[PDB]
Amino acid sequence: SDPLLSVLMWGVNHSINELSHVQIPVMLMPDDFKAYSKIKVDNHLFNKENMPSHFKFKEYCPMVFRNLRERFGIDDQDFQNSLTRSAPLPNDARFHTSYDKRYIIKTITSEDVAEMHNILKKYHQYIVECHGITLLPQFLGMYRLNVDGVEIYVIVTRNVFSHRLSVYRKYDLKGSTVAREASDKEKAKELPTLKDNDFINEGQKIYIDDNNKKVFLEKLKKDVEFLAQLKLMDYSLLVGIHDVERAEQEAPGEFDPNIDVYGIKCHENSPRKEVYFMAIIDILTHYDAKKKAAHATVNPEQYSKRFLDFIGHIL
Amino acid sequence: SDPLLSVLMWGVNHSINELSHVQIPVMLMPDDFKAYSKIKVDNHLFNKENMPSHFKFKEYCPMVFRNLRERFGIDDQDFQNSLTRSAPLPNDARFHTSYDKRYIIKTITSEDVAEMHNILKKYHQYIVECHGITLLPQFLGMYRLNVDGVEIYVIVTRNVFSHRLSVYRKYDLKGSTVAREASDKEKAKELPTLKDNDFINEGQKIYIDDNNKKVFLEKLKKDVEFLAQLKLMDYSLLVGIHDVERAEQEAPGEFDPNIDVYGIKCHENSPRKEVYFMAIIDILTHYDAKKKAAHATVNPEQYSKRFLDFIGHIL
């Protein structure tokens, strides 16, 4: 349907096939962070039914992302199948979900790509340090697609939410001093995205036990400290709630913690059988559009503390 | 080892994978004869161990050759495996043999490519007419390879000789008025290539029965008439003899006529147990080098008759 989506599937398929032939060492060399793979295809009077006839596909730092996927417990064959066996589905920058709901494909700016290159080494090192146990986005691949005229950049992350268990409530938390509330327009969306005030006002509670809570908050502390160190800000805590009862009305309500890695079960005395999905999202700056907000007070360290204070209170 | 060979294997693999997704109709449209598929790969600081880092692969008329392969009873998966599972072996224009001895890969000039395009439609139509039963070369694919600086063209044909049964004697027959003999240098090669005089002088006989002989000569007549019609000349009858006894000394001596399609068993009263492999080879003009022979009398119709007269006599 969408030619850009076709090129992405084609490219991911190509990219993974290529890597299956490469010998994978335990380590990355400094050059792997500067590397890329470029393919330009020109078909003249051939294969019109599947593909655009002129296109480009570029993969950034293929070894680093190969290395990241394995560290995040993702097999390259599964990753390939998830993205190629059937088209990713949209939902209206744009984003798509792998047909099997395991991965998110987000469209990003060339600026975001530049910034991602800039932090990639430090990010990789962080992932090594924490043994891939983090609430940070799991970056799984980054690509450039060209189809006659149009150039787009995409990044692929692991879904914060479950691939089985549906989410009925969804929050996006920053802990900002300025008031954050979903629009009266937004508060009426299909599955809306609520914000800080929506959480305070409606007195939402997260029923997880003290251990889970301590572990989570420790992970969060380290992750956010790392983000502040990179001078990054404006990230959010995405919180999604699965209602086992409501999902039965429309494993009994249990999940695979190896696929749905951000899941946390509610404790025994929880008012309703709930599973939580929580993670940091949207870590890049995107100054192009933040300059667009400016044209027509808090620093990264401030934000870090403000954000950590708030999440500590709501749990 | 040889980067050009690596690109060919890579390209054939790519090309066949692409086609496995295309819906194959029973017919070719006129545009399929003008079509091609072009891939340009640039790897920067990536995958140095397998592939050259900058290369191009072009496939000419992919649908026509897909259509030809099936008409010649060749499955695309087998064709792919034969050319990709292990490197083709040389033997010192250059030519290579698929590791399994089923296919020949010949290096040709851009002129040969131009001429092949020119006759491709008429050749396809001929193959349709004779239901793929012909002594003509079976053209199976045509490609252009570029590896930083060097550009080569290759064509792939079915081996005239067997993939199991070794050939101990080998003739190349034109039936020319001018004397054709292998050099005293050549007559001493490992497995030499003998010519017209070598055949007359050494009184070689081909022991096939009257039916086989009649069928063969009828096929030959049509094939050669077709070649003369295209104003082509200077082609040869390649004759290879397998000695069942000698191959035992170094199925008992029987072959699969579906893989070794040019095989003909000897008749019952044959002096020794022999299998023959006979086919027309080298049909293109290559005027570049024939002008090189000129710079430092017979026409296509003459050649046709001369060639047919001679082969009739020797069998």
> Does A295 contact chain B (CB < 8 Å)?
no
DSSP notation for chain A: --HHHHHHHHHHHHHHHHHHHS---SS--GGGGT-EEEEEEEEESS-TTTS-SEEEEEEESHHHHHHHHHHTT--HHHHHHHHHSSPPEE----EEE-TTSSEEEEEE-HHHHHHHHHHHHHHHHHHHHTTT--SS--EEEEEEEEETTEEEEEEEEE-SS-SSS--SEEEEE---SS-----TTGGGSSS--B-HHHHHHTT------HHHHHHHHHHHHHHHHHHHHTT----EEEEEEEEHHHHHH---S---TTTSTTEEE--TT-SS-EEEEEEEE--S--HHHHHHHHH----HHHHHHHHHHHHHHH-
Instruction: For tokens 């022979």, name the residue.
Output: B293
Exposure letters B51-90 (e unless 16+ CB within 10 A, then b): bbbebbbbbbbbbbbbbbbeebebebeebbbbbbeebbee
Residues 56-115 of A with CB under 8 A from B: 62-63
Phi, psi of A89 (to 5 degrees): -100, 135
A35 contacts chain B (CB < 8 A): yes
Q: How far apart are CA B141 and CA A167, in angstroms?
A: 53
B260 CA: distance to closest CA in chain A (Å): 32
Which residues does chain A have within 8 Å of residue B63's beta carbon, measured at their own beta carbons? Answer: 46
Q: Which whole-number Å values give the CA distances from B297 to A28, A36, B200, B227, B230, in the listed order?
A: 68, 59, 23, 18, 18
Residue A176 tokens, joined? 């900002």
Residue of B nearest to A40 (CA): B40
- Among B88, B26, B71, smallest CA distance to B261 is for B71
State how far the Cα of B32 lies from the Cα of B34, in Å rounded to an integer: 5
B44/A34 touch (CB, cutoff 8 Å), yes or no: yes
Resolution (Å units): 2.5
User: In this structure, are residues B28 and B63 in contact, taking their beta carbons and an 8 Å threshold?
Assistant: yes
Q: How far apart are CA B174 and CA B235, in angstroms?
A: 7
Closest CA to A155 of A99, A100, A115: A115
Find, among A46, A45, A61, A43, the residue nearest to A147 by Cα: A43
* Superfamily grouping for domain B3-158: Phosphatidylinositol Phosphate Kinase II Beta (3.30.800.10)
User: Cβ contacts of residue B301 below 8 Å, gap of 6+?
Assistant: B228
| C-alpha angle B174-B179-B185 in degrees, rounded to nearest 5 | 95
Distance from CA of A52 to the nearest CA of B (A): 12
Instruction: For residue A12, give both structure tokens.
Output: 């991911």
Among candidates A41, A49, A62 on the partner chain, residue whose Cβ is nearest the Cβ of B38: A41
| Number of CB pairs, chain A paired with chain B, less than 8 A apart | 74
CA separation for the pair B86, A269 (Å, rounded): 64
Are A309 and A175 within 8 A, CB to CB?
yes
Q: Which residues contact A280 (CB under 8 A, 6 or more apart)?
A: A135, A136, A137, A220, A223, A224, A227, A235, A236, A237, A238
User: What technique determined this structure?
Assistant: X-ray
Tell me if chain A has a CB within 8 Å of the CB of B30.
Answer: no
Q: Is A258 near chain B, with CB under 8 Å?
A: no
Cα separation of the two ends of chain A? 44
Residue A108 amino acid letter: I
Point out the residue among B31, B39, B44 whose CB comes nearest to the CB of A36: B44
Rounded to whole angstroms, the Cα distance separating B62 from B32 reads: 8
The CA-atom distances, in angstroms, between A137 and each of A157, A167, A238 are: 6, 19, 11
Q: Is A48 on the interface with B (CB under 8 A)?
A: no
Residue in B45, B59, B63, B67 to test binding to A, most A beta-carbons within 10 Å:
B45
Burial of A269 (0-12, 13-18, 19+ CB in 10 A): exposed
The DSSP line for chain B is --HHHHHHHHHHHHHHHHHHHS---SS--GGGGT-EEEEEEEEESS-TTTS-SEEEEEEESHHHHHHHHHHTT--HHHHHHHHHSSPPEE----EEE-TTSSEEEEEE-HHHHHHHHHHHHHHHHHHHHTTT--SS--EEEEEEEEETTEEEEEEEEE-SS-SSS--SEEEEE---SS-----TTGGGSSS--B-HHHHHHTT------HHHHHHHHHHHHHHHHHHHHTT----EEEEEEEEHHHHHH---S---TTTSTTEEE--TT-SS-EEEEEEEE--S--HHHHHHHHH----HHHHHHHHHHHHHHH-
> Looking at the annotation, which residues of A are catalytic?
106, 234
Contact A45 B31 (CB under 8 A): yes
Q: Which of B78, B100, B209, B234 is catalytic?
A: B234
Q: How far away is chain B from the Cα of A29, in angstroms, using its nearest Cα?
A: 10
Active site residue B106: yes
All residues at 6 or more sequence positions from A52 whose CB lies less than 8 Å from its CB, including other chains? A3, A6, A7, A147, A148
Instruction: Give the number of other Cβ atoms within 10 Å of residue A109's Cβ.
Output: 16
Query: How far is Cα B236 from Cα B32, in angstroms, rounded to an integer?
Result: 30
Integer Cα distance of B152 and B139 in angstroms: 17
Other Cβ atoms within 10 Å of B260 Cβ, number:
21
C-beta atoms surrounding B282 within 10 Å: 14
Q: Give me the amino acid identity at A6.
A: S
